[PDB]
Design a protein around this ligand. Structure first.
Ligand SMILES: Nc1nc2c(ncn2[C@@H]2O[C@H](COP(=O)(O)OP(=O)(O)OP(O)(O)=S)[C@@H](O)[C@H]2O)c(=O)[nH]1
Ligand SMILES: [Mg+2]
Length: 332
């Protein structure tokens, strides 16, 4: 029979990217929609460079250009920043290429947590040479990193080994949550995606609430929802690669945002192949934040299945979603 899964989670957690991985592994890619994602990807390139140059002078302390000759380039991006009907000429990409080379732009980028920057910014700025081509055809990875806000309820159906899987993609930001109750129809499991990398960042709806705290507070609402007593949650502790990069950078300490982290220790009861202990301790702590919520209530009527996920790694999502189907079988 058909298993109906529901992706819940805060904004920009990675739910839509999970479906995109399902369209890579169990349906044949994307229909040629697509070729319009080029516009969405180019909007990301425009959004990233616009957000960084506007932040260089509003961050405290501010960041100047490393080369004063780049001033006319920053003046160009500020003039095209509000234009919604942008043409995307080569002049745009030529300035973005040399602006990203300016160390001041990189310096402002490394402080991105002090403003709102999409997580695909570094990837597309580092892949500007391809995106600027006239015959630029997006890679599957380019399509995974493409960020578009989800409004409404998007449905995706696929089957693996002759069993059907209906998947519901929803919007994560606060105003989209109002419609979530409509998706509570005939749900076999819930896939809650949480952005573990965003422990030092704030959400976009108010620029005040901590993003990881938003996921934790939202996860408690789902777990302790009166209507969801029976429903179990498959917890995707997402963005492990971006989580490792900032733990290995050592600039934003988790303790600064979650003080109880100083006492948490890796439970002696197993890391991956040569995984840095700093990365290990970080991801197991974020897990114990959720597991603490889910162990407090439930009384055995439903359970929570955690997984470490990287929604942009096709091989990872294959492995994670593979034994997800095993969990559904044991539910029988
Ligand atoms: N590097 C990296 N990027 C990720 C990962 N998961 C998601 N992203 C990126 O984050 C961005 C936002 O992901 P998205 O799928 O739109 O989240 P969402 O939950 O659907 O966001 P919303 O629709 O509720 S607002 C995308 O550009 C995606 O590529 C990850 O595990 N690693
Ligand atoms: Mg979405």
């Amino acid at each position: 029979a058909t298993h109906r899964l529901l992706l819940l989670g805060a904004g920009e957690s990675g739910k839509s990217t999970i479906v995109k991985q399902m369209r890579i592994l169990h349906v044949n890619g994307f229909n040629p929609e697509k070729k319009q994602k080029i516009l969405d990807i180019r909007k990301n390139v425009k959004d990233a460079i616009v957000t960084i140059v506007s932040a260089m002078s509003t961050i405290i302390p501010p960041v100047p250009l490393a080369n004063p000759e780049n001033q006319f380039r920053s003046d160009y991006i500020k003039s095209i920043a509000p234009i919604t009907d942008f043409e995307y000429s080569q002049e745009f990409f030529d300035h973005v290429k040399k602006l990203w080379d300016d160390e001041g732009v990189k310096a402002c980028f490394e402080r991105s947590n002090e403003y709102q920057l999409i997580d695909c910014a570094q990837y597309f700025l580092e892949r500007i040479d391809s995106v600027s081509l006239v015959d630029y055809t997006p890679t599957d990875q380019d399509l995974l990193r493409c960020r578009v806000l989800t409004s409404g309820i998007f449905e995706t159906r696929f089957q693996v080994d002759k069993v059907n899987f209906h998947m519901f993609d929803v919007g994560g930001q606060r105003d989209e949550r109002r419609k979530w109750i409509q998706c509570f129809n005939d749900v076999t499991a819930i896939i809650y995606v949480a952005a573990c990398s965003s422990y030092n960042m704030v959400i976009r709806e108010d620029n005040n609430t901590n993003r990881l705290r938003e996921s934790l507070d939202l996860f408690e609402s789902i777990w302790n929802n009166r209507w969801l007593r029976t429903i179990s949650i498959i917890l995707f502790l997402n963005k492990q690669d971006m989580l490792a990069e900032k733990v290995l950078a050592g600039k934003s300490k988790i303790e600064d945002y979650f003080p109880e982290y100083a006492n948490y220790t890796v439970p002696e009861d197993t890391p991956d192949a040569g995984e840095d202990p700093k990365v290990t301790r970080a991801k197991f702590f974020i897990r114990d934040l959720f597991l603490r919520i889910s162990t407090a209530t439930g009384d055995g009527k439903h359970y929570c299945y955690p997984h470490f996920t990287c929604a942009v790694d096709t091989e990872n999502i294959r492995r994670v979603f593979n034994d997800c189907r095993d969990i559904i079988q044991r539910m029988h």
